[PDB]
Amino acid sequence: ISDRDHFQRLREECRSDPGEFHGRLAKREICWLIEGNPAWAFYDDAAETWTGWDASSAAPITLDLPESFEPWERAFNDDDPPNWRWFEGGLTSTAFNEVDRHVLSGHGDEAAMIFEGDRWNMASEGGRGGPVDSEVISRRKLLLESAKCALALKALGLEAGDRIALNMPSIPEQIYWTEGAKRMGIVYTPVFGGFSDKTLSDRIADAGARVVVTADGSYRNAQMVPFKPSYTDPALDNFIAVPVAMELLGQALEVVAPEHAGLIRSEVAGLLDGEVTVERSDVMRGVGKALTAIASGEAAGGAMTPRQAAQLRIAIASALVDSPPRVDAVVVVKHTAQPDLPWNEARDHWSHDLTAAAGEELLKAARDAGFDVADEEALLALSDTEFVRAIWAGAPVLAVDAEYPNFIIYTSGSTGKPKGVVHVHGGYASGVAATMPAAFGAEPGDVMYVVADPGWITGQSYQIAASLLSRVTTVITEGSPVFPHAGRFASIIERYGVNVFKAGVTFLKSVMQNPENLKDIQRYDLSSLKVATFCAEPVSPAVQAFAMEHITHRYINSYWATEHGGMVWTHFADADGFPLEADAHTYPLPWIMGDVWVEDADGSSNGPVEYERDTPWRVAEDGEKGEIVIALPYPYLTRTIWGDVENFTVEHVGNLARVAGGWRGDEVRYADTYWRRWKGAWAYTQGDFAMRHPDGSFSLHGRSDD
Numbered sequence: 001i002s003d004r005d006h007f008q009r010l011r012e013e014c015r016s017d018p019g020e021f022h023g024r025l026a027k028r029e030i031c032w033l034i035e036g037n038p039a040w041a042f043y044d045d046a047a048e049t050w051t052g053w054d055a056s057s058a059a060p061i062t063l064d065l066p067e068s069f070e071p072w073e074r075a076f077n078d079d080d081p082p083n084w085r086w087f088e089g090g091l092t093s094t095a096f097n098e099v100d101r102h103v104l105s106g107h108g109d110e111a112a113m114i115f116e117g118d119r120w121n122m123a124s125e126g127g128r129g130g131p132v133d134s135e136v137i138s139r140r141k142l143l144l145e146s147a148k149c150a151l152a153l154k155a156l157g158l159e160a161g162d163r164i165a166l167n168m169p170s171i172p173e174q175i176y177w178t179e180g181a182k183r184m185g186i187v188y189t190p191v192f193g194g195f196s197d198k199t200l201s202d203r204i205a206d207a208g209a210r211v212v213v214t215a216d217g218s219y220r221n222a223q224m225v226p227f228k229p230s231y232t233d234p235a236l237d238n239f240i241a242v243p244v245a246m247e248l249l250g251q252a253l254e255v256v257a258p259e260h261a262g263l264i265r266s267e268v269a270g271l272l273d274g275e276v277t278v279e280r281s282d283v284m285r286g287v288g289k290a291l292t293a294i295a296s297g298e299a300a301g302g303a304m305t306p307r308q309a310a311q312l313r314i315a316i317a318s319a320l321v322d323s324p325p326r327v328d329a330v331v332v333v334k335h336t337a338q339p340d341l342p343w344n345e346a347r348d349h350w351s352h353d354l355t356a357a358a359g360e361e362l363l364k365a366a367r368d369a370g371f372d373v374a375d376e377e378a379l380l381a382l383s384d385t386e387f388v389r390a391i392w393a394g395a396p397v398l399a400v401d402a403e404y405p406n407f408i409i410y411t412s413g414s415t416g417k418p419k420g421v422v423h424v425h426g427g428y429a430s431g432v433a434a435t436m437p438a439a440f441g442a443e444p445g446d447v448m449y450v451v452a453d454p455g456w457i458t459g460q461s462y463q464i465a466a467s468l469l470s471r472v473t474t475v476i477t478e479g480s481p482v483f484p485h486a487g488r489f490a491s492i493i494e495r496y497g498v499n500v501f502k503a504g505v506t507f508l509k510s511v512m513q514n515p516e517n518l519k520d521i522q523r524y525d526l527s528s529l530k531v532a533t534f535c536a537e538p539v540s541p542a543v544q545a546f547a548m549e550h551i552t553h554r555y556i557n558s559y560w561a562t563e564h565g566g567m568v569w570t571h572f573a574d575a576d577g578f579p580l581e582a583d584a585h586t587y588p589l590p591w592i593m594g595d596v597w598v599e600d601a602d603g604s605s606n607g608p609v610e611y612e613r614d615t616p617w618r619v620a621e622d623g624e625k626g627e628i629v630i631a632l633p634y635p636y637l638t639r640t641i642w643g644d645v646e647n648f649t650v651e652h653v654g655n656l657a658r659v660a661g662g663w664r665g666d667e668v669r670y671a672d673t674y675w676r677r678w679k680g681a682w683a684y685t686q687g688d689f690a691m692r693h694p695d696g697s698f699s700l701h702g703r704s705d706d
């Protein structure tokens, strides 16, 4: 896949009548469950018919209406103003297209992931250096270990709707659990290890995760950094959700004078407004301001008996500390294996204990289906088709509606606590999968090194999702691309023959400080690189040029944010009409109706609008800085903010799951933040300063909001 000419961009852009267009590609990039018996299949151009696999064994072909057929009930739905639904009624799975598909298509021994640990042997590789820890993960191992994780989550009592929180380093085990969570429909939240125990506590509370998966520690810069004792433990122990503190506050308050009780509730509520979880002390300090005010006698009359005030302080204290457990169990990966790890016998589980038991359950089920596998060694001797048949015996894949939530990732906003955006299985997977051949030359078998952490959207969408979806080996790195020296990322490229490089900008500018760092990069053979990209911050044309001369010529710039789900502004592989200069410019993809608008008191407010509205802006002039916007939705865009948990209920019957109609997360807060900027029109407003150029290119100049 790739766009040839400048004519092609514009043919596709107008051709992009949302439904028909994205529908054409989604049939091909990812597989769908189609009706005979049900089968995972996709439209294969090389075969011009739907190829695929039986949902209970091996490979057939289904010829029903092939180009025209639609595995969904309706491609595109535009009835609500910003609440879009793509491929409704279609059953798919992020886990299947990321794991099972490729084993099941005869690429089991292929390298899904290359993992590199942080620690470094300078003298390895004849003085060039090598990692201390490193592993190549076959697609069959990724399927086995994740299927084991899936059964472990089930054994913990998790159902298809429930939610988990991951607080882990970039290591292979996080992927295993993540892909295992997808296999069971369990929605997860990756919490990067750089945040604070109170951030992790807020994301647990808000996601409603009753299980957490963390680690004992990781290795950052050749030093053992604890994880569980420093994040998960305090987040669960030392914080409670504000509605729980109030509930317990009401219980404590129930031999009290109603006027005194009322003052106490409001006093604490104002100190907790906007917060998600807080330390129990924040509540007490609030009570002390209310009691001291009552002892004064000046508020709401009343006069607390010194004894009564003390009794209240005791009842409220005792209730907050005896709060109920926030989590049913915490899973702990042994990774650093440091001594004297704080342990809670009532909730802590060693991941290996649970995954091993999950293997025996996996092996027993296979034997009940007649495979004759006494041990994991026997299993990893079957063919690809029979290997995956055996896995399905005990850990089948759950097929979820296209709009089923895949994960919840939090990103900081202009006001208030960071919010969690939802990404579904359907549009999200088919969308990012398409950007790989469109922006890079990414074909199956290639290798991609994405400098990222699964806690970031680059981690979720490209390090993991777009890689496993495209059958492109991904390099998992535990540490920084410049530790110990500036040539670390170059060494990885050389030794694994990386073909695609996706990273930020800061690591390079730190390289350009002293000239000595460049020499370290020049040690390594980067000829395997056919494209790199910038993607996380504004890059100066000086950086891009430096990187063009010393890493790879085709070092493009790409713009997108957590909400975008995948790249929306990039450069096109093997295209003719679109040049590439060291100007930090980017092009909008055809399905992206990007434009730059600006507030103007005298507002024509009649630009490119496919969806208008009632309730001052104008199309910015070439070279005029304003807001960057998208006027038409697309599949892999976030659907809503995570909310309305009370009405999130999954219909789970058999190995099929859907979200009971009527749930749209916190729809209101979603539209207000992203879609209700421009009066008169419906357009997505990411909040970034960009400016259009005559040749159809864009240049970004930083965040516009706060």
Ligand SMILES: Nc1ncnc2c1ncn2[C@@H]1O[C@H](COP(=O)(O)OP(=O)(O)CP(=O)(O)O)[C@@H](O)[C@H]1O
Residues within 6 Å of the ligand: 411, 452, 456, 457, 458, 459, 534, 535, 536, 537, 538, 539, 557, 558, 559, 560, 561, 562, 563, 686, 687, 688, 700, 701, 702, 703
């Ligand atoms: N090519 C680019 N040029 C300039 N700024 C960019 C950019 N790409 C992203 N940004 C900026 O990054 C911000 C997005 O924050 P977010 O963290 O969700 O995306 P990201 O690219 O940083 C994911 P990650 O943390 O994985 O790197 C954008 O809002 C925008 O300010």
